[PDB]
Swiss-Prot record:
Residues 3-441 form the Hexokinase domain. Its EC number is 2.7.1.1. Changing G248R: In MODY2 and PNDM1; pathogenic; highly decreased glucokinase activity; decreased affinity for glucose. Changing A175T: In MODY2; decreased affinity for glucose. This is Hexokinase-4. It comes from Homo sapiens (Human). Changing E429K: In HHF3; increased affinity for glucose. Belongs to the hexokinase family.
Length: 447
């Protein structure tokens, strides 16, 4: 139990969650106010996706999706249901970002994207078409409108120079026009949360929140227009992109941050930023385990003191490993093969120890996440006048989807924190591509 004291350092009492939930609600209120929006850690960026204005055009839309390591392009067919609209990916391609598309300028990257966009249309015998473009761009943006907004600053590792501070929809067309090959109506730009929330909404009208727990972690919700001070008008409702991943950036979380958190921060491409996300996101989960495993080896408590050449390099313990280790049936084969691949020869108890480290890190990720969701939901509840508020959350993300137990721990906690709420979780089917497209089909009955 010399180990079980090290890992206990991940535990969070319900009291700790309530504190975090209340602080989230607090920074969310600050982000929405004129006086404090500028230094707010939780920017609460308005998205200009508005309460059903009702004006949808059917037809085929192209959808981009930059935000992961695998940039995507797809075509989607929007139509007209009894509900509202139907949608469906019809054809689709994925392309790696090189690395010279990172390190260099943004234009390079958008030219690379432009290449792929064309490459897609080549291979689809459609290069001779003019389609409305939906763009899911999963980074923080200050929107002037549904189709104009600036990159506040890259997260999740992306480092492309000269992209910060600029019209992202600008840099895009900028590069689409340096092609001539094709013409695109870049109608609409959305965050992944919103994309997802929109597509879930068309499945379920109760969906007023969108959540992503994958490489990164973030959320978006339907706000009352009179509370979005950064937008003129008091009638209706606008979806607001919280950007809660940067909760803790003004120190809100210092009492919770562990050494493993401090070390992950310093070494990251975004030091001092996105602190909350760095407790949850799958860009960081495995790195936290690596770090936890290492302390255990220096304390001579695991791997019989010694450590692999690989275990000792940043980004070696992939998040998917956390996941696999937790799906091990007990026979340890699964834990062994990951560790052996890494260059280790664990024993029965090493395996068990690596298991415990994983569960400590992902259980905390889940709990910490549940507090933010509970923050958002309980805030919303203050604007709902009915004994039992029924809300629906749309969710996407590898960590949420693929990890053997996150979903379950996550739900139970969220529910403990949200009295008088009946919550529904719905997982977005292709909901990003469809999301950007469905948002386009509406903003197109405008441009
Ligand atoms: C998600 N939800 C639930 C209740 N109201 C909403 S917001 C919603 C629903 C359906 C379509 C749109 C939408 C898309 C693009 C521009 C716009 O103003 N609205 C916005
Ligand atoms: O990709 C999911 C999320 O992860 C990152 O935190 C981004 O800042 C954000 O904009 C996004 O919505």
């Amino acid at each position: 139990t010399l180990v079980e004291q090290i890992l206990a350092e991940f535990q969070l009492q319900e009291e700790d969650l309530k504190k975090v939930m209340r602080r989230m609600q607090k920074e969310m209120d600050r982000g929405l106010r004129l006086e404090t929006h500028e230094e707010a850690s939780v920017k609460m960026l308005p998205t200009y996706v508005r309460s059903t204005p009702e004006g949808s055009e059917v037809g085929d839309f192209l959808s981009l999706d930059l935000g992961g390591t695998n940039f995507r392009v797809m075509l989607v067919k929007v139509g007209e249901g009894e509900e509202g609209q139907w949608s469906v990916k019809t054809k689709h391609q994925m392309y790696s970002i090189p690395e010279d598309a990172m390190t260099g300028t943004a234009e390079m990257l958008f030219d690379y994207i432009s290449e792929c966009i064309s490459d897609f249309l080549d291979k689809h015998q459609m290069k001779h078409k003019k389609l409305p473009l939906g763009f899911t761009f999963s980074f923080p943006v200050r929107h002037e409108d549904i189709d104009k907004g600036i990159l506040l600053n890259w997260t999740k590792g992306f480092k492309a120079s000269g992209a910060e501070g600029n019209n992202v929809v600008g840099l895009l067309r900028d590069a689409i026009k340096r092609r001539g090959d094709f013409e695109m109506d870049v109608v609409a730009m959305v965050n992944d949360t919103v994309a997802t929330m929109i597509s879930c909404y068309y499945e379920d009208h109760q969906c007023e929140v969108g959540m992503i727990v994958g490489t990164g972690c973030n959320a978006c919700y339907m706000e009352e227009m009179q509370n979005v001070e950064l937008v003129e008008g008091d009638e209706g409702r606008m979806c607001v992109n919280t950007e809660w991943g940067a909760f803790g950036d003004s120190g809100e979380l210092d009492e919770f941050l562990l050494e493993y958190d401090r070390l992950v921060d310093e070494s990251s491409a975004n030091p001092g930023q996105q602190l909350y996300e760095k407790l949850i996101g799958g860009k960081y989960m495995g790195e936290l385990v690596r770090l936890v495993l290492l302390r255990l080896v220096d304390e001579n408590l695991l791997f019989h003191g010694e450590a692999s050449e690989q275990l000792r390099t940043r980004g070696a313990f992939e998040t998917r490993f956390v996941s696999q280790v937790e799906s091990d049936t007990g026979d340890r084969k699964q834990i062994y093969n990951i560790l052996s691949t890494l260059g280790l020869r664990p024993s029965t108890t090493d395996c068990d120890i690596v298991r415990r480290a994983c569960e400590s890190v992902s259980t905390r990720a889940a709990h910490m996440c549940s507090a933010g969701l509970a923050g958002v939901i309980n805030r919303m509840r203050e604007s709902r006048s009915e004994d039992v508020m029924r809300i629906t959350v749309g969710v996407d993300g590898s960590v949420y989807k693929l990890h053997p137990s996150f979903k379950e721990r996550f739900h139970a906690s969220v529910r403990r924190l949200t009295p008088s709420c009946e919550i529904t979780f719905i997982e977005s089917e292709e909901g990003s591509g469809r999301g950007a497209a469905l948002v386009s089909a509406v903003a197109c009955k405008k441009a």
